[PDB]
Structures are given as structure tokens and as C-alpha cells.
């Protein structure tokens, strides 16, 4: 009944005016206005009546463009006189008098004014560079590389860059992967102009939060590393374009022709690789970049509403605040869901309910600089929050597309997803009488099943990275998004992300983002309020056969080798049959509960709440202190991919180019070893006794 | 009245007839006979009515001399000719037909045949080798090195003369540190022969556990280090000697005369330092030690008593059997006061007891080569231990003297500790009416407060190391010991320490080891069956306000430095002020409690149970991964010594000769912020909201 009023009470129009209120200036992290912004959800949330809200501050390493160095790229000829230099635009239509858009740049780049010869490196993914080294006869040593934006997070282009060992790199949206066909581009569609460059930041951080002080909250007193030695920041500069500039740059390459149409994008140009230009004045492409990193205070806020019962138990529902222009679909549709499902939890309140558990409500700060708020204030709570946590649901964007719903969450979470999907009306068009678990099952079925829609495992990309991934509580995150080849939406971190484009060619009635407000608001609820924490253990045993399949099919290539080197995947096999046991003994257990034995309730809480925490181990993967999840890991080649088995796939991968096959077999050994014996202290956390 | 029939039940003459049936035969790790042992304690848990009691075993790295290739250390003549070679021994009277005791040797020792120029290096300690190297003009490198046993762990002296460049070190028992005034040598009285030397291993494990499997139970699958790369492993020779031999290879030494008093020991020579011989056919010193390492299995007996309210809470009571000979102080005297223990808990089952929380009985195995069974168990079962237990209270020797209690504790048990021996009565000469509180504070009283018997700070030296110092849980030690400038006691880890040298020298009545038995079980009866966790969280602010001060007066010396590096300890004092309002307020608020609400009893043992995890940061001390505790470590000079502030101690330390000032004073600054942020996290875990 009170799941009902929760979901019942939001309304579809309340989140319009929401997105209205918050989109009207730039909200930048770091910056006065995204401040202000905190103030106004403070002073919401407690004229909604939550029992808190209040600012928690950090003060983090930023990178913000120098207004009187501008960045740009060049193209000089052999006399050093520029030819051509990249360029900037005006607010969008009805934003004329904004005068503080921070122009296109990528957060973090090295300083310097490297010149060289230009090389197309498509994706620039580890798999582009290996066909450059190994098959085309390239050499990116000493280059600058212009590399298409898309396929995975552009942190690991530029890490992937610099091994290569290019001098920079540029970054350009091509609109093969960000200008969807037959549609305008903004103002009259939905597209990206040939004038719009994507922000970003290009750190590596692997989970670290604040470059300066990795482990540890970014305080007053707080010990600090030297600048040059951040963690994650890039030691090349990286610097975005639009096509329009991108097309000029790529016109004259000359050397090998693409090596496959894979390699082409949509411009009116060869996409030939380079190095040099043939059939032009251009002959070397220069960068300038100049940002400035500078440590600047940032606010998350955070309120609650304390639990009735177990107060010392928390659901975590936290969404970034921060943007890079006005934000409209990234975060600050996630903003307005947040406040509208904070309004619903206060009008509960307002009728004398309160939750079994405590509600803790986050607006980060600085989640486009690495997830640094909601990073900072897990590495201040970690004490707390690893005892007590039950779940963290995020509430970034809402609606990164129109077509259906997408879900990434742990398999303790897939059963009451789908529960709840059920029981929400779908908002496409033509499933009128018909639930969002319907609609979302015809639209993405999932590959393992074909009765149930698609799950997908838990990498990065926002804010619930070290909750998941360093600390072990239960993960998900629901959005709206695309059915179509373009990467992300075609106008992402673009100054043309307004409400405007959202209620225009996003979702004009509001139905389909307060669905996700329905499921996200619905989740927190059954998760702080039901007797028994709504996890199923099973999901997880399935899970765990899917995965130890997975990841031996790959190994299979190998057989040889693992038969030299006596490398066996028996151990792993044997951890997830007796995983598997456990599981299902408790669940035969927990049906026998005795509800009324508060003490019973609680001991079987406590293995539903730390079971995922058993995956987490302090030593954490290699070369990474800060994921240490052995089920899971952002993926070493895409922080936006969850790969399972991490340690085993990345002792692995491209195994047979490792210098030396011995120790390079060993290491998968080692990995194997450590997955089995997780899985088994994660079963023995079930036992009875 | 439970408390004081669990008390009351144990008897002497049980102890006594235990001890005698556990030291006939010797039982070293790894040994057929120690394995009789674990089934023969197994057996009797199980006619004690033992919910549980089961072998767990491990395979893990051991080393035992080479039968066919005896070690021994030489001095020869400048034409290569043997002059002298020291030797064995036969078995203590009464062990005639005993076969298989394990000559004198120390446990992992690299193999070689060094020959070189012999030093005196006194005890080998750090000042030792400060001294030899910045004071008394010796260079180490390249030279035998022979150090006396005492002060500090063995292990430390070896990793002190690699750090010097020795290339081999000789260890061996000083009459000044072994031989007490006015005592016969066993058998007429208690002290140690010239003939016998003391075994023990000479890893430096620093919490790692089996060198192979370091964050990781050894079992059958599991991937281990190459043994070359196993950790702790020292990389020279080291053997150990009597004092007969080692007068011989000291009476000769030339070159610099020592240095002061504290350098000369008790035999009848000079104590010169060397290097080389003066007045002598003696020219070189060579050893020759080729201990064999191998994989082993060890069996540790794990039994329960199950709780009926909290069967998913744990107290543990862990004590080593394993010997180096008979054993029959080390560990053996424990070993009979644990079975006395787990025999009066089964007597109060019988009559229908049983305990609110979960008792853990551990019989550990190869204590003596690192601690190996009892931390692969932790290993193991790290996830249900780190999240369930209590406290953990040890049950290694109880009698290594008889002149008054020693109890080393976190400050969390000091308050039961001291409520418990009130309630004990003293075995003590003279004190026939009075507590052993009472005889203890008379005896023993502490340096910060002289009406309350000392308590040290938990280092090492027993199985408690891995569970408090790498789990965070809180654990405590109690036992008998001398009052007496000798270090141990003289028979410590030999042939003699036999079950007639107790009973004759030690413990006649047994009196003494009854009341360590007392006090244990005792403590392990409240901490297991009080409805709220009997720790005290002041007491352990005091302590902090204490160490606080402590490691500000060391720095003291240095404060020019620490103007010009901006170092300065105010977060550490605010994060020790605010620790102590939470622990005042958590203490006014627990009072309160209603002890009728079971979940608002669980909430608040929760906080008593998860206080010491928070001091735990699982990024480790540096170089250490497996010491996690950032108010106390075992000392870096000396394991058994625990340190307070580890990280901002080792930081200082010596700083004003660190080659790069710079560098170093930012390294104590990291120091004091993590241990200002733990201090303020352990106290946000008390806060009400
Ligand atoms: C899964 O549980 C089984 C049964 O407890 C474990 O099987 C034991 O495996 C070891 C070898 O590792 C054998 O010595 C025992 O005989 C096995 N007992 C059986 C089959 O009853 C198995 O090790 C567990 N898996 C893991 C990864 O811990
Ligand atoms: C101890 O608690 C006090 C009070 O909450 C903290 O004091 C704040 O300290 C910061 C500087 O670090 C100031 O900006 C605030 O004005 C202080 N507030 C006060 C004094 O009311 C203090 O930081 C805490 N200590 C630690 C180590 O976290
Ligand atoms: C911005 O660039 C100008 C011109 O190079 C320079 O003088 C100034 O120092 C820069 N600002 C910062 C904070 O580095
Ligand atoms: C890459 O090119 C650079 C040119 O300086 C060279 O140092 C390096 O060895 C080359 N590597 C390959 C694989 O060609
Ligand atoms: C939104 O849905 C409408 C109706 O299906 C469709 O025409 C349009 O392309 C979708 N918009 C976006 C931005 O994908
Ligand atoms: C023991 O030493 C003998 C003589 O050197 C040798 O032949 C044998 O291999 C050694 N045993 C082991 C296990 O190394
Ligand atoms: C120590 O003596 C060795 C002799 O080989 C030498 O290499 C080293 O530099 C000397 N160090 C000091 C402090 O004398
Ligand atoms: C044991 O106590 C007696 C009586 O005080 C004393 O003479 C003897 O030295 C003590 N024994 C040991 C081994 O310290
Ligand atoms: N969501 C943002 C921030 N970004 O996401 C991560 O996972 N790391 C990171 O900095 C982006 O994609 O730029
Ligand atoms: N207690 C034994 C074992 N030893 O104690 C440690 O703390 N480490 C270690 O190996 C000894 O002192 O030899
Ligand atoms: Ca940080
Ligand atoms: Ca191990
Ligand atoms: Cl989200
Ligand atoms: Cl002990
Ligand atoms: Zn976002
Ligand atoms: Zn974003
Ligand atoms: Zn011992
Ligand atoms: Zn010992």
C-alpha cells in the first residue's frame, strides 16, 4: 500500500518544473552557481521533511581552461606560419546572455605545445593500437593522434595513447557515432552541429577519487601529494573538437589507406592513417593546451530520514548534481528525479509513515572530475557505511534516450527489479495498458534468457563506482536510453544539453522519466523497509556458473598452454558448485524465519547485507588499490564496461604476447586461486554454522 | 554465579596431570606426534561435550634440519685446517629412550658455507648496528657476525645483520641474558646449560603467515610463491649455539675493545668486537647450515559451543600446541590450562548451560615457524571473523615465571581484565587472603597510574598477532612471568623445558597456573555470555590522549623541522578530543539502553564489537600489507614490543639521517592525517546519527 502511495504521489509534471529550476544556468563543479544549486536541494529536502540536509565539503584537485592562455590546435607549414587553428560558438537559442560556459577542453590534460605529424588512430582502444603496431606498420611514437570520441571511456584513449607513445592526442566527435540519420541538428533536431565539442575529463584514476589523496577524505588537514604525482592524471595533452575542425584536420592525411571499413567514420574525407599530409601549405599539426589544476572546494548534500527500527542500516539513494554546460539530460534529469522522489518520501512522512531503515539522500558534487564527492565522502564514512549499508541506488540521467528502460545492477538485485518493473506503468507509446517490465522485456531480452529483459553487469560511469567496486555494497542503476549506432546521445556534454532538447525530442509528457523516478524511488523503498532485505542469493550462484563458463570458454584458445604450464580452472569450478549449495540452503533456511524473533530477522539481515561485501579483498587487483571487488571490475580497457573475473581476464588477455610465458601463466594461477577461494569465504558467510 | 562455578571448577591437579600427558613425548609442527596430539585434544573436546571439534588442516612452508648433512659452525687455520667445530646432546634425564629431538638450528635460515672474519655485534639490535657502523669505526659487510640472543626477536637481529652486509650471522645465549644469579643449571636447578641452544625461526613475516600464501589459506589448490620469492625468507645463514661454543669463538677476538659495560656479557672474555683474532691457530670463522625447507601439512582443532542468542557472534579462545622440544612452558603449559578451560565450560553444558554467543576453542599448529596455523585460519575464514567476533583471548604459556600476572590488551578489556582478577584469588606467597588484582598492582603497577597494575600494548609473539593486528579484533593476553635482568626465562625454546622443570622450579602447587586458567576462562565467559559487550571505549580514548602525547614529545627534538617542513600534529590532537566526547557520549547513551529491546541491545554491541575494526585501514603500514592497525604495530625493531602510532613512529625515526629531508618530513605528515582521519572515523562510528 505505501510502495503504491510513494510511486502514486510522483507526477510526471513536478519533474518537468524541477528541470526547468535547474537547468537555467551552467552548474559546473567547483563554481558558484552549482553552490547555489546545493543550497536550493538543501533547502528542499527540508521543506519536504527529511530529518537532515546538510553540506559536506571537500577540497579536491580541479582543471578548469585559463582565460587568458586559450587552448587550440594548428596546422603550420614547413615555414611555421599557421594555416588553419581550430576555434568559439554562442549560448544556445534563449541562453544569449550566459556569459560563463567554460569552453570545450578535456579536464586534466597535460600542459605543453607538442608538434608533430598527425595519425588517425580510430577508437583509439587497445584493440586500434594493437592493429596499429602489429598489423598496419605504424608507429605512433613521437605523433600526434586524432582519435574518434566513442566505444568506451576517453580516459583509456589517452592512457591507451600514451603507451603508444604519441606526444597528444586529439579528441573529435565524428558523426558517425554521434549524429543519429535523418534527424536536424539542434536547434531543429536533436543532433550535434559540426561546431560542439564533448567536455570530459581524461584521468585514470581506477577508483582513487581526488587525485591528491587516494584512501582518505579530501579534508582541511589532510595530507596532500604533490601535484605531479596525482593519481590518474595523463602526462600528454588531450584537447576535444568538433567535426567541422575534425574534417580539416583529417582532409590531407596521407600514408596507408584505412585498413577497413571499420575504420571510416561519416566525414567527407579517406580517413587514411597517416603519418604526414600529401595534396596540400599543411605540414605539421601543433597543440596548445593550458588548463590549470587548481584544488577548489566542492559540496555534496547529504540528509536522511532515520529508520524506526533499524537506524543503524542504510539505503543510499545518490545522484551527481554537477555538469558541464546546463547539464539537462547529464545529471540534472537524475537532479529533478531525486528531488521528486524526495518530495514523495516526505508526503509518506507528512501521514505519520517512516522507513524501517535509514534513507541517507546524496547530491554529489564533482562526479564529471572522477566521481570525486560521492568518492570523497565514501573514503570519510567507509566505517560506517561497510557495516551498515544495504544498498546504493544511483540517480544520474534519467533519460539518455527514449526507447527503453536500461538496468545495470549485482544479481542480488535482479529479482527485485523485476518485481517492481512489473508493477509500474510502461510509458512507451503503444504499451498503454501494460507494465515497464513488459515493454522493456519486447525491447532488450536478455542474451542468458529470453523471458527476462537485460541486466548488465556493474563496471563505472557514475557515482556508484566505490560503493560497489572498493566497498562492496549492493549496486543498480535504471535509466531510460537508445534501442541505433551512435555512441552515448549526440548532444552529450555539449553546451546544447537544455531543457529545451529533453522536452522537445526526449520525452515531451515527462511519462518516460517518471517511470524512472517510479522504479528508483520503489527500490529504495522495498530495500529501507522491508522485514527481510529483498536479495535473492540464488541469482548470484547463476550468476557465478555464467561467469566461471565465460571465462574458461576464453581460456580454451590456450588449452595448450594451460596443459604446460598446469594452469586449471578445477578450484573455480568447485568454489561456485559449493556457492551454489550454500545458496539455496539459505534461502530453505530463510523461508523458515521466525518473523517475530527480532534477533532471527536480524542475524539472517546481516548475511543478506554482507554477502557482497565477502567479494571485496583489501589487497585489491593489480596495480589497483582502490577496486577490489574479485566478481567484478570496471573493465582495464573501458572504466564504462563491467568485466567479471577481472584479476583471471586481465592475467589473460593477450597472453601470448607476454614477454615471458612462465610467469605471465603463473599470474593467471594466481588469479584463479584468488577468485576460488573468494567465492568459497563468500559461501561460508551463508553456513548455519 | 555461572562465572564463579566455571571458576571454581577448575582444578590444579587437573592442569597439572594435562601437562604431564602433553610433554612426554616432544611434538614439533609438521611431526607425526603433534598430530597424535591434535587427536588426542580433538578426543577430549568431544567427551567435554564440545558442540564441535574438528581438524583443519594447511599446507605450508616448513624447515627442518638435513639428517645426512649436519650444520655446524667452524674455525679454521690460514691452511684451511678444522681447529674447532662446535657440536649433540643427549636428551634431559628421564627422555633417555626419546629418539627423534630436533638438533639446535634456526627455522628457514638460508643455506651456505660463509667464511669470513667473525664480529661481535652485541645483541644485534638497530642501536647495535647505529653503534658498530656511525661510532666504533666496524663495517659489517662481508663478515660473520655473532650476536647474543635477548632483548628483541631473533628474526629482527637477522634482518638488522642483513641490513649490515653480514654474511652470516651466529646466535647464541649469553649467560648475562640466560643464567639467573645463584641458580644450578637444570637438572639441580632452572637455568640453562652451557651445552644447549635456543631454535627458533628467523623469518620476518611481518603478519604475512605461510611465506607461500601470503593473504590466502594454503589449501590444496591454492597458488604459492616460488620458495625463493616465499615471504620473510632471510638471505643469509644463521645458526644457533651454546655458551661453551660461543666462549670459544669470542675468546680471540681482537681489534677495538668493547665499547661500554652494556656491550660485555658473563663469559670469561674480553669482548672485543673484532673483526679477526688476536693472540692465537685461529684465523677464519665458517658456517656451514643447510636446513631443508618443505611444504607441510599442520592441523589446527577448531571446536565450538554454539550460542543461544547470538550464535552468529564469536568469542575465540586460541592457543598453540606445537613445541620446539617438549615444550612444556611453551606452549604446553597453555595447552593443559585451554583443555582445563574447555573441560569447566563442558561441566556448566552438562547441568543445561549454554552460552549467549558463539565460544571458538582453537588448538593452534607451527605458532613456532610464523604463526602459520593460526593466521591461514584467520586467512580463511576472514570474512565471517571480521564481521562476528568478539574478542579473541590467547592461550599460549601461562607460567614463564613466578613472580606476578602480565596481561597485554587492547585498552576496549582493561576494565573487565581488572574486574576479573579482583574476583581471583591470588596464588601468590604471602597473599593468601587477597585478589590477584591485589598481588599484581603490588608487583606490577603502571607507569601512568600507580594504583592500577600494568598493562603493555599488544605487538607480537603469539597467534593473537593476525586477529588483532591485521582483523581489528580487540585481544588480550594473560600469564605468569618473572619480576630479573635475564630476557625469557633461561630454558626458553630447549631441551629443558621439561614437565619436572615446571613442577620442581615453577609451579609446585600449581596454584599459579590455575589462576591464568581462571582468569582466561573467565574472561572468555563475560565477553560471551554478557547481554551488552563488557568493553569500555574511554578507556580507550585515555589511551589515545596518552599515545598522543607520547609521539609529540619524540617529535620534540626535531621541532625546527617541523617548523620549516609545515608539520604539525593539530589533527591528530583534534581527532584525539574529538574521540573522546563521542566515547563520553556513546557511554552516557548505552546506559540508557533498554535491555529488553533486542534490536537496540544489537545496535549498540554492534558499535562496542565494530570499534577496534576501525582503527583497521586495509591499505596496510608501509612495506607491511598484513599489519593493518594504525594505533598499534608490532615494533619494526622488534616484533614482541607493540608500537603505538606505528606509521608516525617508523616515520620519524632516524629522520635526521634520511639522505632527503624533504622527502621524509612529508612522509610523518601522511602519517599523522591517516592516523588523525582513523582516530575521527573510529569516533563517527560511535555517533548517535
Ligand atoms: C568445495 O567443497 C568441497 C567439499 O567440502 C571441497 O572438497 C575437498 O577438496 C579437497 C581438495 O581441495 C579434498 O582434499 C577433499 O577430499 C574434498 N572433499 C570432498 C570432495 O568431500 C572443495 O575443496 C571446496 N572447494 C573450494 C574451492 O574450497
Ligand atoms: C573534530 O571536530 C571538530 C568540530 O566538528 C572539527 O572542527 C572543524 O575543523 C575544520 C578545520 O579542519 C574547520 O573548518 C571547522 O570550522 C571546525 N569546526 C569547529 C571547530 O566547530 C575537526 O576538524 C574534527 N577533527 C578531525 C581530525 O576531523
Ligand atoms: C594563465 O595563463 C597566463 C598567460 O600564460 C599566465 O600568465 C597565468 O599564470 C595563467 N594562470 C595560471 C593560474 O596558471
Ligand atoms: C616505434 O617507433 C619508435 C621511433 O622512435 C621506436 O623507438 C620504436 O622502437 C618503434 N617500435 C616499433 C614496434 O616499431
Ligand atoms: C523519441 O521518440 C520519438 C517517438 O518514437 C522518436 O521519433 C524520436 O526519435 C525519439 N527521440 C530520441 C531523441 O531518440
Ligand atoms: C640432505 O643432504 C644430503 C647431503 O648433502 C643431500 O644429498 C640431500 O639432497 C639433502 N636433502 C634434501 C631434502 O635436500
Ligand atoms: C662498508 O664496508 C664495505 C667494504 O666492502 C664498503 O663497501 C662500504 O662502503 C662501507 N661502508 C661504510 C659506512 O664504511
Ligand atoms: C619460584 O618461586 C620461588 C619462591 O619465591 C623462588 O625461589 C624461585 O626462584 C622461583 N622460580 C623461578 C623459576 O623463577
Ligand atoms: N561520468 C563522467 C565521469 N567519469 O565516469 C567515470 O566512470 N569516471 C569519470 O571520471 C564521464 O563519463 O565523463
Ligand atoms: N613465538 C614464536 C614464534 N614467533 O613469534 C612471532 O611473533 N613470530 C614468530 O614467528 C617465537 O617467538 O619464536
Ligand atoms: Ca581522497
Ligand atoms: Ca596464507
Ligand atoms: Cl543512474
Ligand atoms: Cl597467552
Ligand atoms: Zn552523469
Ligand atoms: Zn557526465
Ligand atoms: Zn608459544
Ligand atoms: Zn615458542
Request: hydrophobic share 35%.
Amino acid at each position: 500500500s505505501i510502495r503504491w502511495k510513494l510511486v502514486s504521489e510522483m507526477k510526471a509534471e513536478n519533474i518537468k518544473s524541477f528541470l526547468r529550476s535547474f537547468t537555467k544556468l551552467p552548474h559546473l563543479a567547483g563554481t558558484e552557481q552549482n553552490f547555489l544549486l546545493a543550497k536550493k536541494i538543501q533547502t528542499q529536502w527540508k521543506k519536504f521533511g527529511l530529518d537532515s540536509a546538510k553540506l559536506v565539503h571537500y577540497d579536491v584537485l580541479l582543471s578548469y581552461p585559463n582565460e587568458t592562455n586559450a587552448n587550440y590546435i594548428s596546422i603550420v607549414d614547413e615555414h611555421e606560419t599557421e594555416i588553419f587553428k581550430t576555434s568559439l560558438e554562442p549560448p544556445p537559442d534563449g541562453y544569449e546572455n550566459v556569459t560563463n560556459i567554460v569552453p570545450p577542453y578535456n579536464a586534466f590534460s597535460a600542459q605543453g605545445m607538442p608538434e608533430g605529424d598527425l595519425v588517425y588512430v580510430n577508437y583509439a582502444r587497445t584493440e586500434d593500437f594493437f592493429k596499429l603496431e602489429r598489423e598496419m606498420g605504424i608507429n605512433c611514437t613521437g605523433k600526434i593522434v586524432i582519435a574518434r570520441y566513442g566505444k568506451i571511456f576517453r580516459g583509456n584513449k589517452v592512457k591507451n595513447a600514451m603507451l603508444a607513445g604519441a606526444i597528444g592526442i586529439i579528441l573529435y566527435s565524428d558523426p558517425a557515432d554521434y549524429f543519429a540519420p535523418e534527424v536536424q541538428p539542434y536547434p531543429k533536431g536533436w543532433n550535434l552541429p559540426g561546431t560542439a565539442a564533448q567536455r570530459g575529463n581524461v584521468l585514470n584514476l581506477n577508483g582513487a577519487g581526488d587525485p591528491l589523496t587516494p584512501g582518505y577524505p579530501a579534508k582541511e588537514y589532510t595530507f596532500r601529494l604533490d601535484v605531479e604525482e596525482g593519481v590518474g592524471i595523463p602526462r600528454i595533452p588531450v584537447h576535444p573538437i568538433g567535426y567541422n575542425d575534425a574534417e580539416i584536420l583529417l582532409r590531407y592525411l596521407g600514408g596507408i589507406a584505412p585498413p577497413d571499413k571499420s575504420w571510416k567514420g561519416a566525414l567527407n574525407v579517406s580517413y587514411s592513417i597517416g603519418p604526414g599530409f600529401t595534396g596540400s601549405s599543411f605540414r605539421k599539426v601543433r597543440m596548445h593546451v593550458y588548463n590549470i589544476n587548481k584544488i577548489t572546494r566542492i559540496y555534496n548534500v547529504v540528509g536522511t530520514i532515520r529508520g524506526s527500527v533499524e537506524p543503524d542500516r542504510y539505503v543510499i539513494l545518490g545522484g551527481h548534481r554537477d555538469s558541464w554546460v546546463f547539464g539537462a539530460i547529464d545529471p540534472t534529469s537524475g537532479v529533478a528525479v531525486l528531488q521528486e522522489i524526495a518530495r514523495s518520501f516526505g508526503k509518506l512522512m507528512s501521514k505519520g509513515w517512516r522507513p524501517r531503515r535509514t534513507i541517507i539522500f546524496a547530491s554529489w558534487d564533482a562526479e564529471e572530475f572522477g566521481l570525486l564527492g560521492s568518492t570523497e565522502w565514501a573514503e570519510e564514512n567507509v566505517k560506517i557505511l561497510q557495516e551498515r549499508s544495504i544498498a546504493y541506488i544511483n540517480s544520474d540521467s534519467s533519460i539518455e534516450g527514449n526507447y527503453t528502460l536500461r538496468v545495470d545492477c549485482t544479481p542480488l538485485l535482479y529479482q527485485l527489479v523485476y518485481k517492481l518493473t512489473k508493477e509500474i506503468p510502461s510509458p512507451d507509446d503503444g504499451f498503454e495498458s501494460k507494465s515497464l517490465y513488459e515493454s522493456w522485456l519486447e525491447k532488450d531480452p536478455s542474451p542468458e534468457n529470453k523471458n527476462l529483459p537485460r541486466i548488465n553487469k556493474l563496471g563505472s560511469g557514475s557515482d556508484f563506482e566505490a560503493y560497489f567496486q572498493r566497498l562492496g555494497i549492493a549496486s543498480g542503476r535504471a535509466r531510460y536510453t537508445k534501442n541505433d549506432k551512435y555512441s552515448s546521445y549526440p548532444v552529450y556534454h555539449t553546451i546544447y544539453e537544455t531543457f529545451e532538447l529533453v522536452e522537445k525530442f526526449y520525452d515531451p509528457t515527462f511519462k518516460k522519466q517518471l517511470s524512472v523516478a517510479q522504479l528508483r524511488g520503489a527500490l529504495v523503498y522495498e530495500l529501507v523497509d522491508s522485514k527481510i532485505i529483498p536479495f535473492n542469493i540464488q541469482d548470484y550462484a547463476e550468476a557465478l556458473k555464467n561467469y566461471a563458463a565465460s571465462i574458461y570458454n576464453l581460456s580454451k584458445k590456450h588449452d595448450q598452454q594451460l596443459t604446460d604450464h598446469g594452469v586449471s580452472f578445477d578450484s573455480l569450478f568447485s568454489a561456485v558448485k559449493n556457492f551454489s549449495e550454500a545458496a539455496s540452503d539459505f534461502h530453505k533456511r530463510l523461508i523458515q524465519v521466525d518473523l517475530n524473533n527480532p534477533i532471527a530477522v536480524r542475524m539472517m539481515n546481516d548475511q543478506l547485507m554482507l554477502l557482497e561485501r565477502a567479494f571485496i579483498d583489501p589487497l585489491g587487483l593489480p596495480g589497483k588499490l582502490f577496486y577490489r571487488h574479485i566478481i567484478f571490475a570496471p573493465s582495464s580497457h573501458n572504466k564504462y564496461a563491467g568485466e567479471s573475473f577481472p584479476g583471471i581476464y586481465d592475467a589473460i588477455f593477450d597472453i601470448e604476447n607476454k614477454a615471458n610465458s612462465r610467469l605471465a601463466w603463473k599470474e593467471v594461477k594466481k588469479h584463479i586461486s584468488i577468485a576460488a577461494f573468494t567465492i568459497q569465504a563468500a559461501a561460508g558467510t551463508l553456513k548455519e554454522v
